[PDB]
Symmetry: C3
Subunit: 376 residues, 3 copies
C-alpha cells in the first residue's frame, strides 16, 4: 500500500481534504491536511529529536542518592537512546557495579529500558556506546560529607553533591571528581595532583602538586606530556586550571566550598603528600577536613592559590620572576586560602594569607579547581 505523495513544491499549493495524509517524498515525512491550509502540516522526523533528554525539574540533577551505595533516576525523565524512547514514570533504581573508594562512575540509560552505572566512561559492561547513552555520573568518595562542622568519616559512599547529568554539570569539559557547592558552582573534590593530564585535576590517592612537586606542564601551553614546571608558581597552577576549563577559587568560593571542615585545625606533622590520605606525621586524619560538599582536605593541609590579588606588594621596580614571560611592577600577592599542615589554629574555611607573590614556590602551597555550574 502506497499513499498519495509528491515534492514539497507540489505540496505548497495543495489544500487536501480534512484528515487526508500524504507523503512528502523530498522530506520522507507525512503531511496532515485539514482541507483549508495550503501546504498542510508536515510531521517531524526522528532525526531532529535524537539526543533528546528531558527532565521534570530542569534546575536539579536527574538522580537521587538513596543510600551509601544506591541511587535512582528521577520520575518524568525521558531519554532518546539508539532510536528508542526510554522513559521512567516513577523513580527507578540504578544498577550498580562494585563500588571502590575514590572512583568516578558514569550513569547510562540503555536501549532496553534499564539504567546502570559503570567505572568505564565509554560504555557500561555488556553494552556499547550506541546501545547505552552516557547521561551522567557521580563520585564514590573515600568518606562521608560533613554533617556539621567537624569533617566527615572514612566510610566510602556516594557524594550526593557530586551527581551530575549532561544538562546539570560542571562547565569544565571533564565533570569527574567535582562537587556542587551550595547549588552555586563546582569545586574539585581533591587538591591538584602532579599527574593531572592523565588523571584529571581531581583524583583520590595521588601525589599532590606543590612548590617542591610541580605539576605536569600543560600540553595546551608548550608541554609535551612528560615535562613538569620547574616550580609551583601561581602562574603554573593557574595555567593548569585553564587547561582543564577551571580556575582557582576566589574568597567567596573558598569559604563556601570549605564550609563543614574542622575549623581552626591543621593536619600537623611535616607534610601532606597525597590526596585523601593521612599526612606525614599528621595529628589529624584526612577526614577531619572534609567539607559539607565532600571537598577533601578542604582546609588545614595545603594552601590553595586563589584567583584574586591584594595584600603585600613586591618591589616597585620591574622584576623578572614570571618564568621568562615579562616583568612585574608593584606586583600584589596572590591569595592563599585554607591554611596548611603547619598552620595550627590559623587554618579554616576563611583562612587567608596575602603575603606571597605569584612567583613563590614553597612546599606548602598547591591548588584546587573550581568552575561554573552549567544548566542546559
Amino acid at each position: 500500500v502506497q499513499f498519495r505523495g509528491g515534492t514539497t513544491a507540489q505540496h505548497a499549493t495543495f489544500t487536501g481534504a480534512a484528515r487526508e495524509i500524504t507523503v512528502d517524498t523530498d522530506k520522507n515525512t507525512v503531511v496532515v491536511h485539514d482541507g483549508a491550509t495550503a501546504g498542510g502540516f508536515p510531521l517531524a522526523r526522528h532525526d531532529l529529536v535524537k539526543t533528546a533528554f528531558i527532565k521534570a525539574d530542569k534546575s536539579a540533577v536527574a538522580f537521587t542518592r538513596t543510600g551509601n551505595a544506591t541511587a535512582s533516576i528521577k520520575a518524568g525523565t525521558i531519554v532518546e537512546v539508539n532510536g528508542k524512547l526510554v522513559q521512567f514514570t516513577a523513580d527507578t533504581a540504578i544498577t550498580m557495579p562494585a563500588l571502590t573508594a575514590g572512583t568516578d562512575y558514569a550513569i547510562y540509560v540503555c536501549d532496553d529500558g534499564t539504567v546502570r552505572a559503570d567505572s568505564n566512561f565509554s560504555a557500561p559492561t555488556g553494552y556499547t556506546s550506541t546501545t547505552a547513552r552516557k547521561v551522567g555520573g557521580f563520585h564514590y568518595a573515600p568518606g562521608s560529607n560533613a554533617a556539621a562542622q567537624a569533617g566527615g568519616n572514612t566510610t566510602a559512599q556516594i557524594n550526593e553533591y557530586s551527581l551530575w547529568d549532561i544538562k546539570f554539570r560542571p562547565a569544565a569539559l571533564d565533570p569527574r571528581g567535582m562537587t556542587l557547592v551550595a547549588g552555586a558552582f563546582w569545586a574539585d573534590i581533591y587538591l591538584l595532583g602532579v599527574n593531572h593530564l592523565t588523571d584529571g585535576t581531581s583524583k583520590y590517592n595521588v601525589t599532590i602538586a606543590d612548590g617542591s612537586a610541580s605539576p605536569k606542564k600543560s600540553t595546551k601551553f608548550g608541554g609535551d606530556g612528560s615535562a613538569a614546571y620547574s616550580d609551583g608558581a601561581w602562574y603554573n597552577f593557574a595555567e593548569v586550571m585553564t587547561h582543564h576549563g577551571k580556575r582557582l577559587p576566589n574568597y567567596n568560593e573558598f569559604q563556601a566550598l570549605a564550609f563543614g571542615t574542622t575549623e581552626a585545625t591543621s593536619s600537623g606533622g611535616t607534610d601532606v603528600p597525597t590526596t585523601g590520605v593521612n599526612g606525614t606525621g599528621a595529628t589529624s586524619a584526612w577526614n577531619i577536613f572534609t567539607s559539607k560538599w565532600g571537598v577533601v582536605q578542604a582546609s588545614g593541609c595545603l594552601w590553595t592559590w586563589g584567583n584574586e590579588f591584594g595584600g603585600v606588594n613586591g618591589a616597585s621596580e620591574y622584576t623578572a620572576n614570571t618564568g621568562g614571560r615579562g616583568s612585574v611592577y608593584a606586583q600584589p600577592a596572590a591569595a592563599l586560602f585554607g591554611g596548611n599542615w603547619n598552620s595550627t589554629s590559623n587554618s579554616g574555611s576563611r583562612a587567608a594569607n596575602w603575603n606571597s607573590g605569584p612567583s613563590n614556590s614553597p612546599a606548602n602551597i598547591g591548588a584546587r579547581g573550581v568552575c561554573d555550574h552549567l544548566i542546559l
Copy 2:
C-alpha cells in the same frame, strides 16, 4: 483500519515501497518508506518535544513592554503547553491583573491560546500548573527607570529590563526582582533584606540587611531558618549571595548597574532602613537614586560590599577575625561601592572605599546581588 507493522528489528532490513507508511510497534510511531533506504524514516513522537519553547530572536527576551502597565509576547513565539502547540504569529497583548507597586509577576501561556500575568508563580487565576505554562515574568517597580543621570520618578510601572523568560534570564535559580544591566548581566533591583530566605534577596519595602541588622543565616551553611548571623561581615553577605546563586558586584558591574543614579549625592538624614522607600530624615527621595536599569537605591543610600579585594591591608600577622573559621595575614580590604546616606558628595556609581577589612560590620554597609545572564 490497521496498518502494516512490525518491530524495529523487522524494520531494519525492510526496504518497502515509495510512499509506504508502516507502524513500528516497539516505538509506537509511523515509519515512512522511499523504496530504497533500509530502515525507512521513523517519525518523532510528541513526548520528545514537550517543553518546546521557540523564539524568533533567541538572544532577546520573549516580551515587549508597551506601556507603564501593558506588555506583549513577541511574534514568532511557539510554546508547547499540555499537548497543544500555542503560537503567536503577531505581537499579542498579555492579559494583566491588578498591578501593585514593587511586585513580581509571572507570565503564562495557557492551552486555550491566551497569555496572561499573575502575582502567583505556580498558576494564574482560573488555571492550573498543567493548563498554564510559566514562561517568564517581570517586576512592576514603584518608579520609573532613569531616563538620564538624575534617577527616576515615583510612578509605578513595568521595568522593561526586568523582563525575563525561561531561556533569557538570571542564572540564579530565582529570577525574581532582578534587572538586566546593559544586556551583560543581572542585578538585584533591591538591596539585600534581612529576611532573604522567605523573600529572596531582592524585595520592595523590606528591612535592609547591614552590619547592625544581620541577614538570616543561610540554611545551606548551618542555618536553621530563624537565626541571623552574629554579625554582618563581608563573609556573611558573600555567603548569602552564594546561597541564592548570586555574588557581590565587582567594580565593572557596579558602575554599570548604578549608571543613571544622581551622582555625587547622598540620601542624607540618619539611616536607610527600608528598600524602595525614603530614608530616615532623608534630604533626597529614594527615586533620586534609581539607575537606568531600575536598580533602586543604586548609590548614596548604603554601601554594598563587593567581590574584589585591594587597598588598605590589615596587620601582617595572623589575625583571628573570620568568626572562628581561621585567621588572615595582611588581609586586604573588601571593596565598598556606591556610598551611603552619610557620604555627601562622595557617593555615586563609581564611589569606592577600600579601607574596610571583610571582618568589619557597620550599620552603613549592606549588599546587592548580581549574577550571570543565561541564554538557553
Copy 3:
C-alpha cells in the same frame, strides 16, 4: 482518502486497535494506537523542531580547518533550514568566497544541502536569510597563529580557534573577531578600537583606543554614537566592554590568551597606532606578538587594562577622580598586562604593572575584551 479523526477530548478515552492511525483535528497531527493505551501516541509537528541544530560532538565546534583557506563541516551534523533536513554524514567541504586578510566570515547551511561561507552576515550570495541558515563563522587572519613562542607569520589564513557555531561560541552577543583560548574562554583577536560601536570591539586595521584616543562613548551609558569619552580611564574601557557583553582580562586569562607571543620583547619605536599592523618606528613586526590562539599584538604593543585591583594605592582620602561619579578612598591600581612598545624586555604574556589607578589615561594603555565560552 480521509482518515478517522476527532478532537483531543474524543481521543482521550479512545483506545483504538493495534497499528491504527487517526488524525487529531485540533492538533493537525497523527496519533498512533496500540490497542491498550488510552489517548494513543501523538506524533510531533515539524513546527516544534524548527531551529534544530545537532552535532555529534556538542563540546567541540561544528567545523574543521583543513588548510589556510579551506574548511569542512563535520560528520553527524544535522541542520533544519527552511523546512528541509540537511545532514552531513561525512566531513563536507565549505564553499569559500575570496578571502581577505583581517575579515570575519559567516558559515551558512542552505536548503539545497550546500554549505558556504560569506563576508555577509545576513545571507550568502545567491540566497536569502530564509534559504540560508547562519550556523557559525570564523576569522580569516592576517597571519598564522604561533606554532611555538616566537609569534606567527604574515600569511593570511583561517584561524582554527576563531571557528564558532551557534551552540559553541563567545557568550558575547557578537562572536566576531574572537578566538577560543585553550578551550576555556574567548578573547578579542584585536585590541579595542575607537570606533567599536560600528566595528565591534575586535577589528583589523583600525585605530586603537587608548588614553590619548578615547573610545566612542557607549550608547548604553549616555552616549549619542558620535562622541568619545573625555578620556581613556579604566572606567571607560570597562564600560565599553560591558556594552559588548565582555570584560577586561584578569591575570589568569591574560597569561593564557597571550601565550605564544615572543616573550621579553616589545614593538619598539614610538607608537602602536593600529591593530594588526606594524608600529611606528617598530624594531619588531606586528606578527612577532601573535599568540598561539591568534591574538594579535598580544604583548609588547599596548598595555591592556585588567579586571582586577591591587598593588599601589591612591591616597587614603576621598578623591573625586571618577569623571564626576563619586569619590574613591585608598583606590588600588587596576592591573595593566602585556607591556607596551616602549617596555623593552619587560613585555610578555605575564608582564604586569600595578602602579596605575583607574583614573589614569596615558597613550600606552588600551584594552582587550574577553568573555565566557558558551555551549548550548
